[PDB]
Amino acid sequence: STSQVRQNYHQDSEAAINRQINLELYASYVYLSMSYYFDRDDVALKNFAKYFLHQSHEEREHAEKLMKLQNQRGGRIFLQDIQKPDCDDWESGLNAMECALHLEKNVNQSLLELHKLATDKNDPHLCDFIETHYLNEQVKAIKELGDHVTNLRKMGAPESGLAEYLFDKHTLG
Amino acid sequence: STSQVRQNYHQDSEAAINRQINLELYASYVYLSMSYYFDRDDVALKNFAKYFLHQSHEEREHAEKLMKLQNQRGGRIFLQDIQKPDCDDWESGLNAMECALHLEKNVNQSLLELHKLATDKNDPHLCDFIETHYLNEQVKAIKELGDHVTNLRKMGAPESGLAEYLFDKHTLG
Amino acid sequence: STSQVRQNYHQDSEAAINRQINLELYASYVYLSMSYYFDRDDVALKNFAKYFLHQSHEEREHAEKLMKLQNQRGGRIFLQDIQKPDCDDWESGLNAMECALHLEKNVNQSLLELHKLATDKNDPHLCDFIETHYLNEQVKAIKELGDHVTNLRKMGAPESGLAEYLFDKHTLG
Amino acid sequence: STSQVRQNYHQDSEAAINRQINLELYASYVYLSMSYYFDRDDVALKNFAKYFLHQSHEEREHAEKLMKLQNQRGGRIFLQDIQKPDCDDWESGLNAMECALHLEKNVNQSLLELHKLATDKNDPHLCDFIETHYLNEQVKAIKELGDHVTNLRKMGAPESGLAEYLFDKHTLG
Amino acid sequence: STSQVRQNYHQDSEAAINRQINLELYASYVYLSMSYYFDRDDVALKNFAKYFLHQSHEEREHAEKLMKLQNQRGGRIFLQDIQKPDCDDWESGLNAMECALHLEKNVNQSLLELHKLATDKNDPHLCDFIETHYLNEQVKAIKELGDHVTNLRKMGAPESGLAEYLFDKHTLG
Amino acid sequence: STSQVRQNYHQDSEAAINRQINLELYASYVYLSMSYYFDRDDVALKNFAKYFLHQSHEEREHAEKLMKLQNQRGGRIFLQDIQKPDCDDWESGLNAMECALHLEKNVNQSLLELHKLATDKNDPHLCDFIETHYLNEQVKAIKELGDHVTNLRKMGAPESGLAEYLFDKHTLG
Ligand code: NA
Ligand code: NA
Ligand code: NA
Ligand code: NA
Ligand code: NA
Ligand code: NA
């Protein structure tokens, strides 16, 4: 019943990897919802739409890399429903960037809890996998979203529709 | 409240497009689950894994094209949870191909019901969108999966593990 | 007497690196013996021979990288005899792949014990050297050998000589 | 007052990163002083001058990478005076290489103390940043300077001015 | 004790060159502090950060050219501590440009005092070195910073965060 | 039990080929030990290290060519332990070259005894294999090592560390 490849891979780590797969698929779905909000004819910011669609595809790659890790270590993937995002209408480019920053901090907190579990189960391959492929990516994503929120607030968003239009052209274009 | 672009787009068509978006995202998730089943070390058929991962990414493109249509016609996308697939373990390459054929026939039946609704609401742009981008794609997908099931059964799958290995190398490779 | 470069490098870590050098040279020698078994005229599977000769040369590179680490940290290499492999005749391609999987799991267990010693002696350079250059290589090697054993058993090896011939041509060729 | 990006970044780690920035800027300044000592007309070893000027520019890049890390994690850089180096006249190429080895061991000891603090504050992103970008660089720098000191002493430096001239041409040229 | 190359190089000129080396290293350090202020997530003007980091590296080249001059004329470099800059937080892009203009005028006044000393000691090689490599560079730097301050004030900085964002994109980008 | 390919291949020749395989693997291991001695920070002669590592890899190719010969003639390879080299510390570049000359003369004496056995068992294919692939290689290796020992002794090694440094740069570089 145990996989012939499994070695030093605790059942609690296997279950935490399955929960992280679901959270990465959920973040992919939130960014897909934000992307198509900015494609609506009454919002119409195409480079915001492009930026969040690229983030949706990168979160799906993060989930597929954890599914490959679960099979490489001999664990078994167990998928759950992907809940729908908490908003349908994201209000403004600034509000969506602030929601993305909040989501990325939540994903980063889950990865730090997974690292702590891997360290407590003395699984250095899993600790290094999370440090190499996920933790610096999340620090860079959080710093980029914080810079975007700071620039939109300083330019006068959300009240200034000129600010979001020019940020869409000069920063996200 | 009505979109400034909306013309000849009935609320029942808008709701049926939202249900089809969810079904395409669900099919993407079923094929992602099949792909990583064939990547397990106790199944180990890499070209089956590749074939179903490519199908998962194509179903996500089908869902994003319907989200773009909903915004082009001035409807509003409403997302729902993506339910987890009906199986975790798909048994054999033949059983997964038969499950994919069943899923693609279900998706095709939903598209034929959407076409019938668009014809009854006299929406020729939506009828042509479904004929141009979805109905022939589904007939081709169903005929390719039927050919794969026929070849695997004739070669002696699922009992012959030699049959699935050589089908993985010569048809899916 | 202490090297002028030595810093934060405990004598127990130096001795464990010398034991790991010997185990990597021993694994190189086991794979060289398997390679030339499959080159015999009464076994004659050339791509099995090639696959194990490539593994023998990669294990010698693993040993030379640990010898370079021992000199970079100011430890002193102490070599021991390389024992001959436990078998002369490896029986079949499936039996040799299962023996290789067993050997790679043993090498991985020794590397996990070396990581635990480096963590207990607070030597983060040595922990990171082992995570960066050895632990993911071993997880990938073990998953590839597990996939090869699974495919050979499903195709009907070792009893089916047709199975090993076609695996040699289509997977290892 | 807390940065919007800050997560899992303890104030003691932030202060230790500010001290390491100052030590890397101080090492850049020591190597700049050594470089221009070997450019004097009464010392005149141009490849020693080039080697230490390249080391000065690499230590400034090490300091700027830690300043970028401090902003990526939401800490605040606080700069201090850069003290002048302990020598004006470095005596001979061998004495300067021995002083560089001593300086690089001091920088490495400070990085090992920073790693230990990051491990005690459970900050795996900072532990991995220090292992990935600093600890192996320092082990390589210390082993290269130890090899240079060994070769200059064996060739008869500092008493043999022929030894330093030929080392400048054949090893540093 | 006198260098074999020294000719027509007065001890007061040698000491003034050592003070100018320290001032160029201090200006390099002020611009490095400004650069990383604009890289903070709550300021986030990347092209201001790039512009001041380039100025920091050019001031270090100005210091190294004066160290090369001191050795070419047979004087002896004597380094002093590099004091930390007068600010940690530079407030806004306009305030940092005004501080840079003030710093460059101070550096230019020191170079004009060095030229006057070289003229009073009848050292035409040193007068021409300062005119050729430093005085026109400083007039160009001061005119460029004055143009930047004028444009930022006319666009409405520092109160208009839109002004600094668009200046960062169109003038410094 | 006799191989279907075996013809004119006496059991005493088969056993002598197995002993020569072990001696070539032992010489590979002695040269690997010499290579990493010259990589130590207190010896630090990189081109001596490179020269002996290349010799280690060439002796492993000599052993693998005799394993291929044993299978081509239908004999059975029987491997034995590879004993560790007689020294851990090789003293100086001259002493290691003299030890290599002694080792290569021993390998050549074993090959001349194998040729004499093949001639006494009237096995001209094996005599020609040894003349074509091994005897002139050994005469060239012994003459090159004798030239290296002569040059190092004439330059004043081992007492002159300048001699070994310049031989490492001009002859082995
Ligand atoms: Na992610
Ligand atoms: Na579809
Ligand atoms: Na290995
Ligand atoms: Na450094
Ligand atoms: Na300057
Ligand atoms: Na040989």
Author numbering:
A (entry chain M), B (entry chain F), C (entry chain U), D (entry chain J), E (entry chain A), F (entry chain T): 4 to 176
Give sentences copied directly from the paper behind this entry.
In this manuscript, we have tried to assess the effect of using CDS for cryo-ET STA data collection in combination with the SR mode using a test specimen, apoferritin. Here, we show that a combination of both SR and CDS during data collection has allowed reconstructions of apoferritin to be obtained at a 2.8 Å resolution but this is further improved to better than a 2 Å resolution when processed with SR in SPA, significantly surpassing the Nyquist frequency of the physical pixel size of 1.356 Å (up to 140% of Nyquist), similar to that previously reported by ref.
We went on to collect data sets at 81k EFTEM and 130k EFTEM (approximately the same pixel size as 64k in SR) on the same apoferritin grid. If we treated the data collected at 130k, where the physical pixel size was similar to that of the 64k data in SR (0.677 versus 0.651), then we achieved a slightly higher resolution, but with more particles, of 1.74 Å, which was slightly concerning as we expected to get a higher resolution at this magnification. A potential explanation for this was that this data set was initially collected for accurate pixel calibration and initial detector testing and, as such, the defocus range was not optimised for high-resolution structure determination (the defocus range used was −0.5 to −2 microns). One potential cause of this resolution limit may have been that these data were collected with the beam tilt corrected image/beam shift method, and the beam tilt correction may not have been accurate enough. To test this, images with the equivalent image/beam shift collected from each stage position (49 positions – 9 × 5 matrix) were treated as individual optics groups in Relion, and the beam-tilt was estimated and corrected. The data was then reconstructed, and the resolution of the final map was identical (tested only for the 130k data set). With the increased DQE at higher relative spatial frequencies when collecting at higher magnifications, as reflected by the B-factor calculated for 64k of 77.5 Å2 compared to that at 130k of 55.9 Å2, the only potential benefit of collecting at lower magnifications is that fewer images are required. The density for most of these water molecules was present at one sigma, with a maximum of 10 missing in the 64 and 81k sub 2 Å maps. The quality of the density for the water molecules across the multiple reconstructions was good, with the individual water molecules resolved in all structures at a 2.12 Å resolution and better, with the strongest water molecule density visible as a continuous density at 2.7 Å.
